[PDB]
């Protein structure tokens, strides 16, 4: 119910500023929560500007008019998280959370290490074939993974998932799974994933000839 920018990007050492928009929000107490991937939210700032014990002085807050602001000075990789502002609304007796802001920490571009895995014989025996393409520790997030079977582009038969920014080196990893029936898998010989990324001077292909 409170307005936050979906994303804020900042280089290490720079200052990140996350805004929390709400009509006359300055007349309310604003609290801020940090939620790292896969973890519970952690209180970082309460009552506009007060900090719980254990939270670094790099975190500061302000609130006036129609904008509250969480300021993170000297941003580092450990600051990668979603940040939620919060307010108690006396007029409605509800706690209201902001829509959340993901802080991404910039770093130097890093090309993915590409690996490829054929399906196991045990899975093959069950009548399906899954082949996996792994892109390890790359930056930035934007990457293109194309499956090729006997040089032919595949569509609709693959899914991928990407990890959030690593808390130490600010990189991502990606896993793409190509799935066919064992019958369709046996019709063809060459299985390849072709990855495109900023850290790659040109696209790179990993393959196996079955």
């Amino acid at each position: 119910g409170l307005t936050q920018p979906p994303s804020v990007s900042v280089a290490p050492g720079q200052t990140a500023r996350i805004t929390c928009g709400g009509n006359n929000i300055g007349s309310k107490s604003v609290h801020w929560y940090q939620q790292k991937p896969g973890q519970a939210p952690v209180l970082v700032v309460y009552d506009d500007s007060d900090r719980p014990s254990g939270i670094p002085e790099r975190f500061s807050g302000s609130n006036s008019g129609n904008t509250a602001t969480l300021t993170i000075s000297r941003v580092e990789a450990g600051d990668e998280a979603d940040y939620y502002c919060q307010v108690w609304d006396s007029s409605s007796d509800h706690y209201v959370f902001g829509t959340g802001t993901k802080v991404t920490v910039l770093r130097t571009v890093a090309a993915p290490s590409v690996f490829i895995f054929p399906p196991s014989d045990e899975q093959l025996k069950s009548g399906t074939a899954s082949v996996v393409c792994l892109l390890n520790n790359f930056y930035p997030r934007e990457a293109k993974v194309q499956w090729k079977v006997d040089n032919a582009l595949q569509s609709g038969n693959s899914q991928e998932s990407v990890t959030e920014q690593d808390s130490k080196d600010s990189t991502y990893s990606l896993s793409s799974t190509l799935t066919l029936s064992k019958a369709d898998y046996e019709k063809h010989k060459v299985y390849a994933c072709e990855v495109t990324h900023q850290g790659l001077s040109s696209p790179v292909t990993k393959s196996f000839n079955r």
């Binding site: 895995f117 390890n136 990993k206």
Partner: peptide
């Protein structure tokens, strides 16, 4: 659960990937 076997197609400069 199916293994993701390590091979030459999953090695780079002294490190190997499996899963």
């Amino acid at each position: 659960v199916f293994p993701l076997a390590p091979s030459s197609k999953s090695t780079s400069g002294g490190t190997a990937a499996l899963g």
